[PDB]
Amino acid sequence: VAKAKGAQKTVQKGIHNTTFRRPKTLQLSRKPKYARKSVAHAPRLDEYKIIVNPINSESA
Amino acid sequence: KKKGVLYVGRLPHGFYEKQMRMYFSQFGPVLRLRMSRNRKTGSSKHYAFIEFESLDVANVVAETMHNYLLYGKLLQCKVIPEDQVHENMFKGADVPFKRIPHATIARLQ
């Protein structure tokens, strides 16, 4: 009788039937609609601001 | 052990002797099967009696296909106890029923 009890009785009720780390998930990169600064600032330390003055002291 | 006999009622047009045998076989082996048919034209009476080797197998079907909505028909099957089973529910069972062409044989005769 077990022939029909299993896989003939339950087929009529459906035939198809160590540690955990957070999985890696697709981390997208920024694609801003607006660049947050209109005009990129001109360089802040160039030659004409690095060298300010020569010293002409007696040791110099 | 004990010869289980089963009745099936409200047969959809098509659920005939072969179709039932190839269906109930996977439930379990079926020995003697007859389906009541018209005496004259051999048309279906839409109810059949089947036998199972064990009443336990015979009662298996009675709790699944009972009230089985099929093609708009509610199949009626339940175990018929052996006290009132007659001798020949399976007289001519598993035999292609003979429908004789009464009209044509009359014209030839």
Side-chain angles (χ1 to χ4, degrees):
Chain A
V1 302
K3 173 62 65 67
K5 292 265 96 165
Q8 306 286 316
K9 167 82 79 72
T10 72
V11 178
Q12 173 273 0
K13 314 178 207 316
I15 76 163
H16 308 258
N17 298 103
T18 288
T19 200
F20 199 88
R21 305 296 295 252
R22 140 151 47 97
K24 285 100 180 179
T25 46
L26 198 133
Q27 292 201 348
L28 276 174
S29 55
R30 297 196 148 162
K31 288 208 203 329
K33 315 286 206 58
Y34 58 109
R36 264 60 158 169
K37 279 198 218 304
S38 65
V39 54
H41 203 287
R44 283 159 175 105
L45 209 46
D46 46 348
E47 52 266 15
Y48 304 114
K49 279 181 285 306
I50 282 172
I51 289 301
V52 199
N53 255 330
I55 304 184
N56 54 1
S57 67
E58 217 35 67
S59 100
Chain B
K1 172 66 177 176
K2 185 53 52 63
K3 310 300 289 185
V5 74
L6 206 47
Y7 166 92
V8 172
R10 308 200 189 187
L11 271 296
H13 161 277
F15 217 62
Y16 291 176
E17 294 89 345
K18 203 52 42 183
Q19 284 77 8
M20 317 205 338
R21 247 179 178 290
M22 325 185 318
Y23 174 89
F24 288 109
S25 301
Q26 54 250 8
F27 264 72
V30 46
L31 302 187
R32 296 180 52 219
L33 172 165
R34 180 176 89 92
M35 149 163 191
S36 55
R37 293 166 164 264
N38 167 239
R39 274 207 79 262
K40 281 302 152 304
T41 189
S43 175
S44 322
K45 297 209 177 96
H46 295 282
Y47 64 98
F49 331 98
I50 47 192
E51 192 295 347
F52 278 162
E53 290 88 13
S54 70
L55 281 293
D56 298 328
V57 160
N59 86 25
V60 152
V61 165
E63 48 212 358
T64 79
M65 331 286 279
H66 189 45
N67 276 317
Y68 191 67
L69 165 143
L70 204 46
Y71 281 76
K73 284 173 158 282
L74 267 288
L75 229 52
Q76 296 308 280
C77 50
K78 74 202 171 323
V79 288
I80 173 76
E82 262 183 12
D83 274 19
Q84 62 292 349
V85 316
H86 327 78
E87 71 305 351
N88 56 355
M89 271 66 88
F90 320 118
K91 178 165 76 70
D94 307 354
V95 152
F97 178 69
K98 49 95 193 160
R99 69 159 55 163
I100 206 66
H102 271 137
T104 47
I105 70 78
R107 328 304 333 169
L108 301 189
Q109 195 272 328

